[PDB]
Amino acid sequence: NIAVAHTDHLSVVYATMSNFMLNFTNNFSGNHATFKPDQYVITSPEGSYKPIIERQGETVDGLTIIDTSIVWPILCQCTYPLVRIMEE
Amino acid sequence: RYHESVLEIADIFDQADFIQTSDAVRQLRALMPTLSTSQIRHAIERIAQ
Amino acid sequence: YGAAVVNIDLNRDFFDTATGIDLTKGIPLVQDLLVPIGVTAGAEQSAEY
Protein backbone atom coordinates (compact mmCIF):
# COMPACT_ATOMS: atom_id res chain seq x y z
CA ASN A 1 0.00 0.00 0.00
CA ILE A 2 2.64 2.67 0.93
CA ALA A 3 5.40 1.59 -1.46
CA VAL A 4 4.38 3.96 -4.23
CA ALA A 5 4.65 6.83 -1.78
CA HIS A 6 8.17 5.96 -0.77
CA THR A 7 9.48 5.16 -4.24
CA ASP A 8 7.59 7.66 -6.32
CA HIS A 9 7.73 10.64 -3.96
CA LEU A 10 9.99 10.38 -0.91
CA SER A 11 12.84 9.29 -3.13
CA VAL A 12 12.71 12.52 -5.06
CA VAL A 13 12.85 14.44 -1.79
CA TYR A 14 15.97 12.45 -0.96
CA ALA A 15 17.36 13.29 -4.35
CA THR A 16 16.96 17.01 -3.78
CA MET A 17 18.12 17.09 -0.18
CA SER A 18 21.07 15.17 -1.53
CA ASN A 19 22.13 18.45 -3.17
CA PHE A 20 21.46 20.97 -0.40
CA MET A 21 24.52 23.12 0.25
CA LEU A 22 25.23 21.86 3.77
CA ASN A 23 25.02 18.13 3.14
CA PHE A 24 28.76 18.18 2.51
CA THR A 25 29.93 14.72 3.66
CA ASN A 26 29.59 11.49 1.67
CA ASN A 27 27.58 9.20 3.93
CA PHE A 28 27.28 5.76 2.31
CA SER A 29 28.33 4.22 -1.00
CA GLY A 30 25.41 1.81 -1.18
CA ASN A 31 27.69 -1.06 -0.27
CA HIS A 32 27.42 -2.21 3.34
CA ALA A 33 30.15 -4.77 2.68
CA THR A 34 32.97 -2.30 2.05
CA PHE A 35 32.03 1.30 2.87
CA LYS A 36 33.79 3.38 5.53
CA PRO A 37 33.41 7.16 5.92
CA ASP A 38 36.38 9.25 4.81
CA GLN A 39 38.03 10.54 8.02
CA TYR A 40 39.59 13.97 8.45
CA VAL A 41 41.17 15.67 11.46
CA ILE A 42 42.25 19.24 12.02
CA THR A 43 45.83 18.75 13.24
CA SER A 44 48.98 20.73 13.86
CA PRO A 45 52.66 20.00 14.60
CA GLU A 46 52.06 22.18 17.64
CA GLY A 47 50.10 19.19 18.93
CA SER A 48 46.42 19.87 18.24
CA TYR A 49 44.32 16.94 17.05
CA LYS A 50 40.59 17.35 16.48
CA PRO A 51 38.86 14.48 14.65
CA ILE A 52 35.79 15.55 12.65
CA ILE A 53 34.01 12.29 13.32
CA GLU A 54 34.53 10.89 16.81
CA ARG A 55 32.53 8.64 19.12
CA GLN A 56 31.81 10.50 22.35
CA GLY A 57 28.62 8.55 23.07
CA GLU A 58 25.12 9.79 23.88
CA THR A 59 24.89 13.59 23.81
CA VAL A 60 22.47 16.37 24.69
CA ASP A 61 21.82 17.13 21.01
CA GLY A 62 19.63 14.01 21.03
CA LEU A 63 20.96 12.76 17.71
CA THR A 64 23.58 10.18 18.84
CA ILE A 65 21.10 7.37 19.54
CA ILE A 66 18.75 5.89 16.91
CA ASP A 67 15.39 4.23 17.70
CA THR A 68 14.92 1.92 14.75
CA SER A 69 11.31 1.31 15.84
CA ILE A 70 10.51 4.49 13.93
CA VAL A 71 9.92 2.15 11.01
CA TRP A 72 6.69 0.91 12.58
CA PRO A 73 4.72 4.19 12.57
CA ILE A 74 5.95 4.73 9.00
CA LEU A 75 4.67 1.34 7.83
CA CYS A 76 1.40 1.78 9.71
CA GLN A 77 0.06 4.95 11.32
CA CYS A 78 1.14 7.42 8.65
CA THR A 79 -0.72 8.60 5.60
CA TYR A 80 0.86 10.05 2.49
CA PRO A 81 0.03 12.56 -0.29
CA LEU A 82 0.21 9.68 -2.82
CA VAL A 83 -2.03 7.43 -0.68
CA ARG A 84 -4.50 8.73 -0.96
CA ILE A 85 -7.76 9.79 -3.91
CA MET A 86 -6.26 13.09 -5.12
CA GLU A 87 -3.91 15.37 -3.17
CA GLU A 88 -1.81 18.13 -4.72
CA ARG B 1 26.31 -0.70 -23.90
CA TYR B 2 22.70 -1.51 -23.01
CA HIS B 3 19.13 -0.26 -22.67
CA GLU B 4 17.13 -0.90 -19.49
CA SER B 5 13.38 -1.26 -20.13
CA VAL B 6 10.06 -2.60 -18.83
CA LEU B 7 8.85 -6.06 -19.92
CA GLU B 8 5.13 -6.64 -19.38
CA ILE B 9 4.18 -10.17 -18.41
CA ALA B 10 1.76 -10.05 -21.34
CA ASP B 11 4.81 -9.62 -23.56
CA ILE B 12 6.09 -12.96 -22.22
CA PHE B 13 3.13 -15.18 -21.32
CA ASP B 14 -0.03 -15.59 -23.40
CA GLN B 15 -2.00 -18.43 -21.79
CA ALA B 16 -5.63 -17.85 -22.71
CA ASP B 17 -7.59 -17.80 -19.40
CA PHE B 18 -4.54 -16.73 -17.39
CA ILE B 19 -3.26 -13.50 -18.95
CA GLN B 20 -5.60 -11.35 -21.00
CA THR B 21 -3.58 -10.19 -24.00
CA SER B 22 -6.00 -9.10 -26.69
CA ASP B 23 -4.52 -6.14 -28.57
CA ALA B 24 -7.62 -4.26 -27.47
CA VAL B 25 -6.82 -4.72 -23.79
CA ARG B 26 -3.23 -3.92 -24.63
CA GLN B 27 -3.90 -0.50 -26.14
CA LEU B 28 -6.44 0.16 -23.42
CA ARG B 29 -3.57 -0.35 -20.96
CA ALA B 30 -1.39 1.91 -23.05
CA LEU B 31 -3.95 4.63 -22.34
CA MET B 32 -3.69 4.13 -18.55
CA PRO B 33 -1.65 6.27 -16.09
CA THR B 34 1.00 4.68 -13.87
CA LEU B 35 -0.84 2.88 -11.07
CA SER B 36 -0.44 2.13 -7.37
CA THR B 37 -2.22 -0.80 -5.74
CA SER B 38 -4.32 1.83 -3.98
CA GLN B 39 -5.28 3.36 -7.34
CA ILE B 40 -6.37 0.01 -8.63
CA ARG B 41 -8.27 -0.54 -5.41
CA HIS B 42 -10.01 2.78 -5.85
CA ALA B 43 -11.01 1.85 -9.39
CA ILE B 44 -12.44 -1.42 -8.18
CA GLU B 45 -14.37 0.40 -5.47
CA ARG B 46 -15.74 2.78 -8.07
CA ILE B 47 -17.00 0.04 -10.35
CA ALA B 48 -18.53 -1.52 -7.23
CA GLN B 49 -20.19 1.77 -6.41
CA TYR C 1 -33.50 17.12 -45.93
CA GLY C 2 -31.02 19.57 -44.49
CA ALA C 3 -29.18 17.25 -42.15
CA ALA C 4 -25.67 18.66 -41.88
CA VAL C 5 -23.74 15.71 -40.54
CA VAL C 6 -24.82 12.21 -39.54
CA ASN C 7 -22.55 10.58 -36.98
CA ILE C 8 -22.29 7.12 -35.43
CA ASP C 9 -22.34 7.64 -31.66
CA LEU C 10 -22.40 5.31 -28.65
CA ASN C 11 -26.01 4.96 -27.61
CA ARG C 12 -26.68 7.27 -24.65
CA ASP C 13 -29.91 5.35 -24.03
CA PHE C 14 -27.99 2.13 -23.36
CA PHE C 15 -24.91 3.59 -21.77
CA ASP C 16 -27.02 5.74 -19.42
CA THR C 17 -25.90 8.22 -16.75
CA ALA C 18 -26.71 5.34 -14.39
CA THR C 19 -23.59 3.67 -15.84
CA GLY C 20 -21.67 6.75 -14.70
CA ILE C 21 -20.67 7.30 -18.32
CA ASP C 22 -21.00 10.73 -19.98
CA LEU C 23 -21.26 10.75 -23.77
CA THR C 24 -21.78 14.48 -24.33
CA LYS C 25 -18.18 15.04 -25.46
CA GLY C 26 -18.17 12.25 -28.07
CA ILE C 27 -16.39 9.75 -25.86
CA PRO C 28 -17.26 7.76 -22.74
CA LEU C 29 -16.07 9.68 -19.67
CA VAL C 30 -16.33 8.06 -16.25
CA GLN C 31 -15.31 10.34 -13.40
CA ASP C 32 -13.11 9.16 -10.52
CA LEU C 33 -12.48 5.59 -11.67
CA LEU C 34 -8.87 5.57 -12.77
CA VAL C 35 -7.02 8.75 -11.87
CA PRO C 36 -3.31 9.57 -11.71
CA ILE C 37 -1.66 10.64 -8.48
CA GLY C 38 0.91 13.42 -8.16
CA VAL C 39 -0.62 15.56 -10.88
CA THR C 40 -2.01 19.10 -10.66
CA ALA C 41 -5.79 19.40 -10.47
CA GLY C 42 -7.50 19.05 -13.83
CA ALA C 43 -4.76 16.73 -15.07
CA GLU C 44 -7.04 13.79 -14.27
CA GLN C 45 -9.42 14.37 -17.17
CA SER C 46 -7.78 12.33 -19.94
CA ALA C 47 -8.03 9.31 -17.65
CA GLU C 48 -11.81 9.85 -17.72
CA TYR C 49 -11.60 8.56 -21.29
Interchain CB contact of B39 with A (< 8 Å): yes
Long-range contacts from C29-36, C-beta under 8 angstroms, 24+ separation: C30/B46, C32/A85, C32/B42, C32/B46, C33/B43, C33/B46, C33/B47, C34/B32, C34/B33, C34/B35, C34/B39, C34/B43, C35/A85, C35/A86, C35/B33, C35/B39, C35/B42, C36/B33, C36/B34, C36/B39
Q: Which residues of B touch A3 (CB under 8 A)?
A: 36-37
Distance from CA of C35 to the nearest CA of A (A): 8
Assess contact for A4 and A82: CB atoms under 8 A: yes
For chain C, positions 1-49, list CB contacts with chain A under 8 A: 32, 35, 37-38, 40-41, 44
Resolution in angstroms comes to: 3.1
Q: Which residues of C touch B31 (CB under 8 A)?
A: 49
Q: Which residues of B touch C29 (CB under 8 A)?
A: none
Assess contact for B10 and B21: CB atoms under 8 A: yes
In Å, what is the CA distance from C34 to each residue of A25, B21, C7, C30? Answer: 43, 20, 28, 9
Assess contact for C36 and C47: CB atoms under 8 A: yes
Interchain CB contact of B1 with C (< 8 Å): no
Which residue from B39, B5, B46 is spatially nearest to C39, judged by alpha carbons?
A: B39
Distance from CA of B27 to the nearest CA of A (A): 24
Q: In chain B, which residue's Cα lies nearest the Cα of A8?
A: B36
Helices (H), chain C: none
Method used to solve the structure: cryo-EM
Chain A contact partners (≥3 CB pairs within 8 A): B, C
